[PDB]
């Protein structure tokens, strides 16, 4: 509350560390469905169904331009990428499996870096 604070966690490396995680996600062999925004002109149903499209290149631009106020807002966008994927793709599809794999990959890096 006012004048009552938990000890100050060092957040000075968060930006660099989120960048590193994101590089690792970008270079994963199963990243290909997520690298670029879904083409809303060419994929029927995507625009209407997925109310908040997100992809790694969009995260990278937001990260590089100071648009994440904290590491939780960064995680929220990464998770959004996989939540969107699950919304639109059957589990038993290459893309559906890619999304599950990448989410797992992400969550482990996240826990290991920050928890």
From Swiss-Prot:
Subcellular location: Nucleus
Tissue: Expressed at varying levels in several tissues, whereas a smaller transcript was expressed specifically in testis.
Residue ranges of domain Bromo in the record: 9-113
Signal peptide per UniProt: none
Primary role: Regulatory subunit of the ATP-dependent BRF-1 and BRF-5 ISWI chromatin remodeling complexes, which form ordered nucleosome arrays on chromatin and facilitate access to DNA during DNA-templated processes such as DNA replication, transcription, and repair. Both complexes regulate the spacing of nucleosomes along the chromatin and have the ability to slide mononucleosomes to the center of a DNA template. The BRF-1 ISWI chromatin remodeling complex has a lower ATP hydrolysis rate than the BRF-5 ISWI chromatin remodeling complex.
Family: Belongs to the WAL family.
Subunit structure: Component of the BRF-1 ISWI chromatin remodeling complex, at least composed of SMARCA1 and BAZ2B, which regulates the spacing of histone octamers on the DNA template to facilitate access to DNA. Within the BRF-1 ISWI chromatin remodeling complex interacts with SMARCA1; the interaction is direct. Component of the BRF-5 ISWI chromatin remodeling complex, at least composed of SMARCA5/SNF2H and BAZ2B, which regulates the spacing of histone octamers on the DNA template to facilitate access to DNA.
Protein's name in the database: Bromodomain adjacent to zinc finger domain protein 2B
Species this protein is from: Homo sapiens (Human)
Residues of the full protein shown: 2054 to 2166 of 2168
